[PDB]
Amino acid sequence: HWGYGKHNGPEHWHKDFPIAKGERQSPVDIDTHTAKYDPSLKPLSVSYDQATSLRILNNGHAFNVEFDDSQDKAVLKGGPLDGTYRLIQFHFHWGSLDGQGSEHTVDKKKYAAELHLVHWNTKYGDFGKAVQQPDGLAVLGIFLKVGSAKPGLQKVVDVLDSIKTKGKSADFTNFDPRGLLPESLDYWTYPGSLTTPPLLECVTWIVLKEPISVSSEQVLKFRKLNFNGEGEPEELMVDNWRPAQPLKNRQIKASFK
Ligand SMILES: [Zn+2]
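That is the input. Now the predicted structure with zinc ion docked in place:
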């Protein structure tokens, strides 16, 4: 099955998922000088006051913090979006060392990690229908750099030892994703895809300009996770990022100058 090794990593995915070589694949390099400032872009509306986290899952490629998406309780709107998108889960991508890990890059710079808050368009009723539509998902992408600790991340870090291996989950209630946001909501946006199989071309990407700072100790705990299941040969969950894909016939727009 697909993964992030020599034998099954991103450069192999096209064999099972031919859309990997499609016209709107993610992630991409954000060339900051080429991105067009678009004064028509609205401020992002992130409304997470009523978010209900339920559970955290090691799915063998990342860990997902899952939310109750049975009502409009944690929603993204505004920005480049028309309508309302409900938060279903967040997860991260990260590296074996601090010099790589992000999926998007900024003028070819790689960050230590990247957070993806995944939301689906309520006009399609459920996530599985949304991913079949070109405007089905909105993913908020946030870069992580290593420096000061992110206090709001620590609850996530300190549950990872309970979900070390693929298929483990743990109760994860009352977690407030507002604690993972940077101060500014300035953003880049472009049309793209999920960055994991099935690589569906259903995403409006919203990538924040300002990274959050996490500590080296926080990121080191991410790197103690395992891709493998319980008892299997240990293969650390590191370098679970897809590299930048061709931009093709797309424009990246900036909300800011
Ligand atoms: Zn992701």
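Residues 91, 93, 116, 195 surround zinc ion (CB under 6 Å).
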